[PDB]
Design a protein around this nucleic acid. Sequence first.
RNA 1: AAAAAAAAU
Length: 794
Amino acid sequence: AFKPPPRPDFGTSGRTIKLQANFFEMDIPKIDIYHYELDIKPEKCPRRVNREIVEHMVQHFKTQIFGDRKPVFDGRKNLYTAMPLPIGRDKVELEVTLRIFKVSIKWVSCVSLQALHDALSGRLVPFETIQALDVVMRHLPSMRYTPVGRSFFTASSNPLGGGREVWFGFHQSVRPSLWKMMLNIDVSATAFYKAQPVIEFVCEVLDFKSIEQKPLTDSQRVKFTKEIKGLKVEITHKRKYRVCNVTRRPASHQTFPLQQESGQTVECTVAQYFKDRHKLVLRYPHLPCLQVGQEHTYLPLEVCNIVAGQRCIKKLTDNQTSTMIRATARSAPDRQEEISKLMRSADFNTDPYVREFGIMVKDEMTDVTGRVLQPPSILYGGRNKAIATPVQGVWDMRNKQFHTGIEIKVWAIACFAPQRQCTEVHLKSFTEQLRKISRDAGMPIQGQPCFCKYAQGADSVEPMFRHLKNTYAGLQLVVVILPGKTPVYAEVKRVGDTVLGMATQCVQMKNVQRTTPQTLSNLCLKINVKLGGVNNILLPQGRPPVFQQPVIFLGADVTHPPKKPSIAAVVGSMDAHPNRYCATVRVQQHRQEIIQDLAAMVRELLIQFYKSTRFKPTRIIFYRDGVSEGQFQQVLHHELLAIREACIKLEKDYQPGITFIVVQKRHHTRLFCTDKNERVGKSGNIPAGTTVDTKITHPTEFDFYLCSHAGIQGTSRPSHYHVLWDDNRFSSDELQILTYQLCHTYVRCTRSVSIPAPAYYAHLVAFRARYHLVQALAKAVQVHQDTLRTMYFA
RNA sequence: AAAAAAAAU
């Protein structure tokens, strides 16, 4: 549990294809970079203020300290120069005025750019050197723009509603590769809060055309409170505050302790205070106040604006993200041009600071040779046992039937849509069309539903389900019908998955009224596996050597709340196909990325594997999603030990080979076809299966990019896979082929997906757990015994 | 919730 293995070899499988990546080569001098520390006092100022301080400090002290040198600054403590200041070592104390800060500057170290060069060729990486470069490259944009993490944004106009807005910008990061340093540049866009009076913000949040009223009900108040809680407001009557809460009382009645001349404190209303103190009679005294700072300062809504440049963290409404998707989605050729325009306007080679440090960035995207891997054949069952060949990451189930399809003889219908809109004719039409398709799918639904009724309310689910379970023996499935978003789906699943242990397939009302063969076919895919059926398997002989001996495939992922706990989910294969997965899920610490109870979860799965296959896996392949590079050493430490602990806990001399692989979908590397002949679809993306493990990947470690999916919309994100550990000593080809084939085992669609099925299943499990969430939390997530032997999360 | 992809005082 320590050091990632070196890259074993380079992949050679698949046909070559010319690509270009949004990585721009950096010509970097072999000099030393000089590193100074900065103690600014006070030391809690926002990074922007620190940058203003440093900026003025440099100019004000030109004659005696900085001269013609252009230093760069990281926003906090670290300042760099391309030439050593006349400091030598001894600390100096300074003053700066916007009002008055005390800055001390003290030489710490020499960042060797030569040490970086040799790390790039081999021997064998100074992180602080990479960081020094990053500080240099983003010094200028950090002042001209609004940095968010590693990106930069500005306002243009592009409303999303609810007080939210779209800001366009770009990601920027310096990355090591073999022989070279790379500048990663990609276009980006995120949600920002519109800068406007809080009054208007209230209208957009509560759907008012005009504010012109009467006190908010308890409902309107908590909606608005949730929206503005934690946001920054400024006063119209230049002061900034933090909104910590919205008062229950209106301004005319909300009071606070006010100390008079005698020293005695009395309660005074916010309305009365703003009248005496500011000659201001409140326009809307019936509206509540923003409680700011910390506990008794209150602000009326009409004297506050939402501070500009506030990024939106909270979950977007389904309509908000939609227009965001639409306004941000661009084809691969389109995105490539925007990056070119960005390089041209960023104009790095004329930036004063990178010129100062003698850095040169190339304005041509890096040429990369990729390899398009051959997809696995998909074996089906039924009469003819047809073999499907994915073309452009897609196949279908025409003239084909399930590997093992479940014959349905007993099933029920629970319509929670009103008979008014979902008529008896609809149900009968839906039922008839569903059965025809299912027949063809190799999952024959014989007999009309044993039961079919209507209902309303989440409170009606269990007694209705208690009913069905007790009276209909052999009951396999309850198809539930819902009208749009509604909290009964969560209730249907909670009762179905955790309490009674019954397979339930929810379906929208609209997909019942108007049925299509493709929709029904996709509905049958989920139904079959939820009854323990097997839709299809990888062509057995079209499999890598890893399947020679008992192996279990794990998919782990932790999802964080939109306070509320995080949810860790780990799934594991239960056969040799591999097809069926058992799920383990835990609630854990809010925003804790590491799976705390991993050892226990892995053990459970290992047992389940042994009871299903009567074999102990000789290898454990672990696909870990949702981990940033800055957390590798930490996650690799506890988690590799955790799964190794599970094996020891099982049996003393049980030591299966573990391959620890992190899967990353959240990065900003893009791959584009050099030949226009290689573009696929209207989106013009790279084909399903192109693999990159050269030039732009890690100089020493085992990592590769694999775009396993076909780009339908926008620009494809090629999934990144970084091997943190590998007892099994995989070759580059066999691993890359393995994860690619695993992307063809996702049962919800006849498509190759962007990440391997176990990783995708892990996501679904943790997210199903969210709906299960309506010490007792750990129980509202614990799932019935009979459902476990099914992929209920499918 | 048929489904993948896509922004993310």
